[PDB]
């Protein structure tokens, strides 16, 4: 049958992936898959801080000196990527006919009901902001679950941590609107000036270098994660980044330890523009032992609107995880 990993150059990843139905899905394996990607601003990108300590600008140190560049912080990357997976899940849902819908209701939603989950309407939906605690975006990117989500969690707080960890994504050039009139206030303090980066306008064409580590994923979870990234376009919501981007996956590598970081890659490419960066990066990734990814092939090999395509296996994988999670909670709570 169909083998999307083989269609992409990605067959050698298999030994490193988890299998749906594995009794030990909750137990971690001591390896990771690095994914390196590019984010390019189509129009202007607007960056906004969200609370004390959040940043839009950061320093790249490199051979010729130091430059402060725009940066997309990890929790913004999380927010937009998970919001995209969620939208793809909604479109999958809306692609179902009566036959495939009953599959979802009976084989997925029903199974979730049996497992104690409360958000089990036959009309499926989840948010990014309640959450069901069993859908692919919840299980992959994480959630804080309580008795509100699952009737078996009385007196318990159950945390799912993300299995997709983002580096910050770093711009290679300081291409921002010169702006002196941002203003922030709190009580009797106010702040303005050129160096206030509460809001940043990143110029069209700016490229950011990104990296993520993907751990303990199954095949469809991995592919759907790559695909959610690759299909990012309109960014918004409440995540502090707003505008249109194009994202390209450049390469993956499995290993016990990471071979690179977004920061180092960007620093290597300080001052350089899109085409030069992409060229340099492709070479660097090859030297680092990365398997190239054909972003165009990725987009075509996955049809999230096919009722029996990858997103079916994604849902199977998610409910599998959720089952193992519930079992783990019951087996480790120590009675009661
Ligand atoms: Zn969910």
Element at 80 (helix H, strand E) = helix 74-95
Experimental technique, in short, is X-ray
Residue 218: DSSP 8-state: B
Please check if 138 is assigned to a binding site.
yes
Closest CA to 90 of 128, 117, 140, 139: 128
Q: Separation of 128 CA from ligand 1 center, angstroms?
A: 8
Angle, helices 310-332 vs 74-95, to 10°: value is 120
Residue with tokens 């990117």: 141
Contact 240, 50 (CB under 8 A): yes
Contact 140, 325 (CB under 8 A): no
Q: Separation of 124 CA from ligand 1 center, angstroms?
A: 10
Contact 20, 316 (CB under 8 A): yes
DSSP string, 319-336: HHHHHHHHHHHHHHS---
Q: Separation of 160 CA from ligand 1 center, angstroms?
A: 12
Please check if 216 is assigned to a binding site.
no
- ∠ Cα 26 227 217 (to 5°): 15
Contact 285, 250 (CB under 8 A): yes
Token reading at 104: 């979802």
Please check if 294 is assigned to a binding site.
no
Q: Separation of 218 CA from ligand 1 center, angstroms?
A: 17
Residue 109: DSSP 8-state: I
In whole angstroms, give the CA distance from residue 215 to residue 220.
13
Q: Separation of 305 CA from ligand 1 center, angstroms?
A: 18
Strand partners, 200: 47
Q: Separation of 313 CA from ligand 1 center, angstroms?
A: 16
**Total count of domains within the chain:** 1
Give resolution, Å, one decimal. Answer: 1.8
Element at 276 (helix H, strand E) = helix 274-288
Count of other CB atoms within 10 angstroms of residue 264: 16
Q: Separation of 174 CA from ligand 1 center, angstroms?
A: 37
Q: Which domain holds residue 84?
A: 1-336
Please check if 306 is assigned to a binding site.
no
Q: Separation of 40 CA from ligand 1 center, angstroms?
A: 28
Q: Separation of 315 CA from ligand 1 center, angstroms?
A: 11
């Amino acid at each position: 049958k169909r083998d999307v990993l083989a269609e992409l150059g990605l067959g050698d990843l298999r030994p490193y992936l988890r299998s749906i139905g594995d009794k030990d899905r909750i137990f971690p394996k001591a390896h990771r898959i690095e994914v390196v990607f590019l984010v390019r601003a189509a129009n202007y990108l607007l960056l906004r801080t969200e609370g004390a300590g959040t940043i839009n600008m950061t320093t790249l140190e490199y051979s010729g000196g130091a430059m402060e560049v725009p940066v997309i912080q990890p929790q913004k990357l999380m927010a937009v990527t998970r919001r995209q997976m969620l939208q793809l899940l909604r479109e999958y849902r809306d692609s179902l006919d009566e036959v495939s819908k009953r599959w979802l209701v009976q084989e997925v939603i029903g199974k979730a009901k049996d497992l104690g989950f409360k958000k089990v309407s036959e009309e499926w939906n989840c948010t990014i902001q309640g959450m069901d605690g069993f859908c692919p975006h919840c299980t992959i990117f994480g959630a804080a679950l309580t008795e509100q989500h699952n009737e078996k969690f009385g007196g318990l707080s159950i945390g799912i941590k993300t299995r997709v960890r983002f580096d910050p994504a770093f711009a290679t050039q300081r291409r921002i609107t010169p702006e002196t009139h941002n203003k922030v206030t709190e009580g009797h303090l106010s702040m303005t000036g050129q160096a206030l980066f509460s809001e940043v306008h990143v110029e069209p064409g700016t490229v950011f270098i990104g990296r993520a580590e993907l751990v303990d994923l199954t095949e469809p979870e991995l592919v759907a994660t790559l695909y959610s990234l690759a299909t990012l376009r309109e960014l918004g919501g409440r995540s502090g980044i707003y505008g249109t981007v194009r994202v390209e996956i450049l390469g993956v590598k499995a290993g016990k330890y990471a071979s690179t970081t977004a920061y180092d890659l960007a620093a290597e490419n300080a001052g350089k523009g899109y085409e030069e960066v992409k060229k340099n990066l492709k070479e660097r990734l090859e030297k680092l032992g990365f398997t190239p990814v054909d972003n165009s092939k990725l987009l075509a090999a996955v049809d999230h609107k096919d009722p029996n395509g990858l997103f079916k296996d994604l849902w199977r994988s998610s409910i599998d995880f959720a089952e193992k999670m519930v079992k783990w909670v019951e087996e480790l709570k120590g009675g009661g």
